[PDB]
Amino acid sequence: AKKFKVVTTFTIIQDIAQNIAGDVAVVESITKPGAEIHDYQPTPRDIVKAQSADLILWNGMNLERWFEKFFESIKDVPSAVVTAGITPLPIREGPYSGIANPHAWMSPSNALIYIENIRKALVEHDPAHAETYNRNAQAYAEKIKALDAPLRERLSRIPAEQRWLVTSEGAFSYLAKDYGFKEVYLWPINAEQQGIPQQVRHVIDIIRENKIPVVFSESTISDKPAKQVSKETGAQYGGVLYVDSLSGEKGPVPTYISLINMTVDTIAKGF
Ligand SMILES: [Mn+2]
C-alpha cells in the first residue's frame, strides 16, 4: 500500500534521497524548484506534508533558518541531519561571519557523506527495505565518484592564477576548494542584509586587479547585481549557476548530478 514516506526541506536532498530509496519509498521536498530555501516561509500545507512523513531530512548547518521552529509543529516523526560528519567551511565576512557555510553538497566528495547519512536514516527507520537502500546507496555513490575526472578535465583549460569564481551568493566555497578556485561573491550568504551595494564596489576592484573575465548569478536569487557588476567591469555575465535548487523535472537541472555538471560546465564556458 502506502510506501515509506520521506520529506526533505529542499530539492537537492530530495533527489539524493530518492536515488537511495529507489522504487521502495517516496521522497518529497517541502520547497519547490526555484524557491529560495534559506529564508523560506512555511505554510500550513507544509505542516500537513511534513506530518504525513515517516522520516524528515534536512541539511542543518543552519541552512534552513525556518526548520527548527517549523519542526516544533510536527509530532512523532523522526528527523536526521544529512551533513553529520562534514567539516564546515566558515562564512568569511558579513553579519553571519564564523557561522558554517551550509552549501556542503557542492563538493561531490561531501555528497558521499550525505549519501551515507541518508542510507543510515532509511535503514534505521525502514528496516524492511535495508537491502534495497544499501544496494542503491553504493550504486549512487559510485555514480558520484565517477564525476571527479570529467569535472576536473572540464575545468583544466583555466590556469591556476586565473581560477577566480565570482558569483552572487558565496554559495560555492566547497566547490571552489575542491577544484582550486578562489572565490569572490556579492554577498556571503542569502539573507535580508545590508552591505551589498558596497560589496559590489569591492568586487569591482577585484575584477579589475585580477582581469577576471566572467561573473555569475544563481537560480534562486536576482541576476541584477551580477549583471550590474558585468556592466561596470570588462567581465561578461556568464549566466546562471545552480546551487540552492534543482530545476523542474523537464528543465535543465532536474537531478543533483545534473546540478554539479551544469554548474561546472557553465563556469568553464564563461572562461
Ligand atoms: Mn544558498
From Swiss-Prot:
InterPro entries in alphabetical order: AdhesinB (IPR006129), Bact_metal-bind_prot9 (IPR050492), Lipoprotein_PsaA-like (IPR006128), ZnuA-like (IPR006127)
UniProt keyword annotation of Transport present: yes
Domain of life: Bacteria
Pfam families reported in the protein's UniProt record: ZnuA
Binding site residues for Fe(2+): H38, H103, E169, D244
Any one GO MF annotation of this record: metal ion binding
Subunit-structure text: Monomer.
Protein name: Iron-binding protein YfeA
Organism, as annotated: Yersinia pestis
Source lineage: Bacteria, Pseudomonadati, Pseudomonadota, Gammaproteobacteria, Enterobacterales
Name of the gene encoding the protein in the UniProt record: yfeA
